Every structure is written in C-alpha cells, then in structure tokens.
DNA sequence: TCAGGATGTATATATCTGACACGTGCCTGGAGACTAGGGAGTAATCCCCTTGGCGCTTAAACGCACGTACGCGCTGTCCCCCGCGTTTTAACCGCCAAGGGGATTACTCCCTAGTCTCCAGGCACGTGTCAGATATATACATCCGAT
C-alpha cells in the first residue's frame, strides 16, 4: 500500500526478457570459477586460518586447484542493512532476532558463501527467508529465479505466507497429475513467468529436466535433515542443478552422527568440503 | 459400399547411461627337463553273427458283406463372457535405524584321507539237483443279446 516506492527500478514483467537469464543458453557453460573460489577462500582464511587443512589436501589432489592455492598465497564497506525496524518492502512487523537472522543472511550473501539456518521450530524461519528474498528483489534487483523445495504438507503454507507479507512477488507451486503439471511447466516455467518456484521432494525427482534448464540463483530448501544423506536420490539429483549458491532452512541438524553434518555442509560449499 | 474413427507406425529430437577403450598387478599358461604307466600292437581261443538258402505247422491277416451307432451338420436358445466406463487402492519408489549374514584374505594346525605292505575271507563261477509254473482238458459259473 505504501512500500511500492521500492518497486521502482525493477524491469517490467515480460517472459521474453526473463528468458535471457532464466534459461541458461550455454549448453555446457558450467565451469570452475577461479575468482569465486579465491574470494571464498580469502574470506574464509580471513575469519580464521584453520581452514587450510582441507585446502592443502585438495591441493595434494588436482593441482589446478593447487595453483589457485598458490595464487591466494602470493598476492598476500559491505555495510549490513541492519533494519532497526521491520523491512519496508514487507508489510508487517519483525522481531529483533528475526532481524539478526536477516542480517546474517545478507552478510553471508555479500561474501560469496552461504549459511545453514537451523533455528528452533516456531521462530518464523519462512519469514526469515521471504524477507531475505524480498531484500534481493527490491534492493539487490534480482527478481528471480528461486527454487523453494519443501515438504508437500507445508507447500500451501509457504505460498500463503509469501503471498501475504510480500504480495508483489509472483510464485506458484507445481502439483497435480502429470498433464496439468506439464501444462503449468510449458505455460510458466519454461515460459519464464515467475520469480519463485515451489516444489516437493517428490516433484524435484519427477520434474528435474525442466528444472535443469534454468540458471538458479539459489535453491532454497525447507527442513533439511531430509538431505542429511548424500547418497539419497534427492541429494544426487540436487547436484546437477546449476546454481550460484544454496540455503538449508532446517530445525536441528546432526541428529544421529557427524558424517551427517559433513554431507550437510558439503551441500552448501562443495569446493571446501570436497573430501 | 462408402465415408467415419481409433490405433499402431513411422518421423524427428533432447537425454541418460553403460558399452567400449586404456593402464596396472598378478597370477597362471608356457618352456624346459624327467619319468612312469597307459595304451597300442600281437597273437591264441572260443562263441556269436552273417548270407545264401531249404522244408513244415499253424494261427493271424486279409478280404467281403451286412448293418448299426455315431460323427457331423443345422437349428435353436440361452447365458456367460467380453468391451467399456468409473472409482480406488496397492505397487513402487524413496527413506530410516541397527545388526547379522556371507564373501573374501590371510595364518594355524590337527587329523584324516591316501599310499604302501601283507594276508586271509569274500564272492563269483561251475556243477548238480528238485519244485513252481505252465498247458491241456474239464466241468462250473457267469454276463449278454433276442424273443
Ligand atoms: N507477525 C509474525 N511475526 C513472526 N512470525 C509469525 C508472525 N505471524 C505468524 N508467524 C509464524 O511464523 C511461522 C513460520 O512458519 P514455521 O512455523 O516456522 O513453519 P516451519 O517450521 O515449517 O518453517 C508460522 O508458523 C507463523 O505461526
Ligand atoms: Mg519449515
């Protein structure tokens, strides 16, 4: 009603323009970015020097990462929008711990790395993620795309809240028998008429081939312990998804083991926990 | 008989994966001595099988003729099984937990088999008996088809 001034500067919604970024035209454009890895490792070392343990072993493996190590060796404001009040682009109020979560999300984003949200149940994690995505939309000017894999039960709830506290965002959920699901696919997904896709652990396995053919800004995930095993078919499928970074909204991680946590971390930043 | 539908059948196309190629370590197939026993050649001896016949007995096999009953074709008449639409529910993936089962890969070692040497009891073979089972007759009993 009054937060629309933030919407100024966004391009008009048009599938023809969205096809430029949504579809990844490069058939095999996936490649190891030296710059991103160097930035990640530089910041990681800056926080603490202990992380070289993985790095040196990985340099003992494939040496074209060892030369990245050498490059990072020889060469040696980003102000958080603290949002002391509730973000304007979201109609409603946010509690201070919610605000700190938002700031953590932003700070990790402008560091070319990510971070598992594992807050306790009931503390509006979905609110955190919707707020952060709205931050990317209004401030960072990346409307989409964003995959929001979640459990089938809460799909309606995620859609309800995302339409409630940020109505401007266009989003839908895949569902239904394969005929109407494919209708939605051909009409909006490959039509590039969205900003936030919502699916289920089953649909991701089902409709991967359409979802492969999109450069994914993030791949959000709801309660993540489902992904605790990295030999699970869902984990295998959720690795060919070309993507910039990822998020793992969850409850309590490390439920019955430590290797579990290793794989959970390996999902976010494979180039660090590669071994 | 001809126009009206539903169903493979080709067409072209993006995707997945699992055949195909390549490099290493290990084991086993090949080269080379040595030897001993299995089999090939020989040569007695007895019994069976062959290919021509010949003559005789005696049932079966063949042919012929009524003459039924049954295999086959038609008709009828159900009734039961197929085609089709509509729900719904069970298979089919995906998961989670822990532990047991089964395959390897070494080590170890007992004990139980093979390998010999003697040596006597099996058991197989060649005989000489009897009795269990025919074959006839012979009287009895016991279905089957037509008055
Ligand atoms: N004004 C509000 N501020 C913060 N949280 C709220 C507000 N109104 C509702 N919520 C809660 O935020 C929650 C976000 O969903 P959540 O309970 O975290 O589900 P999940 O744990 O599956 O993500 C909702 O359940 C809702 O009860
Ligand atoms: Mg949740």
Swiss-Prot record:
A motif (DEAH box) lies at residues 222-225. It comes from the Eukaryota. Coiled coil: none annotated. Residues 106-271 form the Helicase ATP-binding domain. ATP binds at residues 119-126. It is found in: Nucleus. Catalytic component of ISW1-type complexes, which act by remodeling the chromatin by catalyzing an ATP-dependent alteration in the structure of nucleosomal DNA. They are involved in coordinating transcriptional repression, activation and elongation phases. The ISW1A complex represses gene expression at initiation through specific positioning of a promoter proximal dinucleosome. The ISW1B complex acts within coding regions to control the amount of RNA polymerase II released into productive elongation and to coordinate elongation with termination and pre-mRNA processing. Component of the ISW1A complex, which at least consists of ISW1 and IOC3. Component of the ISW1B complex, which at least consists of ISW1, IOC2 and IOC4. Belongs to the SNF2/RAD54 helicase family. ISWI subfamily. Present with 1500 molecules/cell in log phase SD medium. This is ISWI chromatin-remodeling complex ATPase ISW1. It comes from Saccharomyces cerevisiae (strain ATCC 204508 / S288c) (Baker's yeast).
């Amino acid at each position: 009603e009054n937060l629309k001034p933030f919407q100024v500067g966004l391009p008009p919604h048009d599938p023809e323009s969205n096809k430029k970024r949504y579809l990844l035209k490069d058939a095999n454009g996936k490649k190891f970015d030296l710059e991103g890895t160097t930035k990640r490792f530089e910041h990681l070392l800056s926080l603490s020097g202990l992380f070289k343990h993985f790095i040196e072993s990985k340099a003992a493996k494939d040496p074209k990462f060892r030369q990245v190590l050498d490059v990072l060796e020889e060469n040696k404001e980003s102000i958080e929008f603290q949002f002391r009040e509730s973000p304007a682009y979201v109609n409603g109020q946010l509690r201070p711990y919610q605000i700190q979560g938002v700031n953590w999300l932003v700070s990790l984003h402008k560091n070319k790395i990510a971070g598992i949200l594992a807050d306790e149940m009931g503390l509006g994690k979905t609110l955190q993620t919707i707020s952060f995505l709205g931050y990317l939309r209004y401030i960072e000017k990346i409307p989409g795309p964003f995959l929001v894999i979640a459990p089938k039960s809460t799909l309606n709830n995620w859609l309800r809240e995302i339409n409630r506290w940020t109505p401007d965002v266009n989003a839908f959920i895949l569902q239904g028998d394969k005929e109407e699901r494919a209708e939605l696919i051909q009409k909006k997904l490959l039509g590039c008429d969205f900003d936030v896709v919502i699916a289920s652990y089953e649909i991701i396995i089902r409709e991967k081939s359409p979802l492969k053919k999109i450069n994914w800004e993030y791949i959000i995930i709801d309660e993540a312990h489902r992904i605790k095993n990295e030999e699970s078919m869902l984990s295998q499928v959720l690795r060919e998804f070309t993507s910039r970074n990822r998020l793992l909204i969850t409850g309590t991680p490390l439920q019955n083991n430590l290797h579990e946590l290793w794989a959970l971390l390996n999902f976010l930043l494979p180039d660090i926990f590669s071994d």
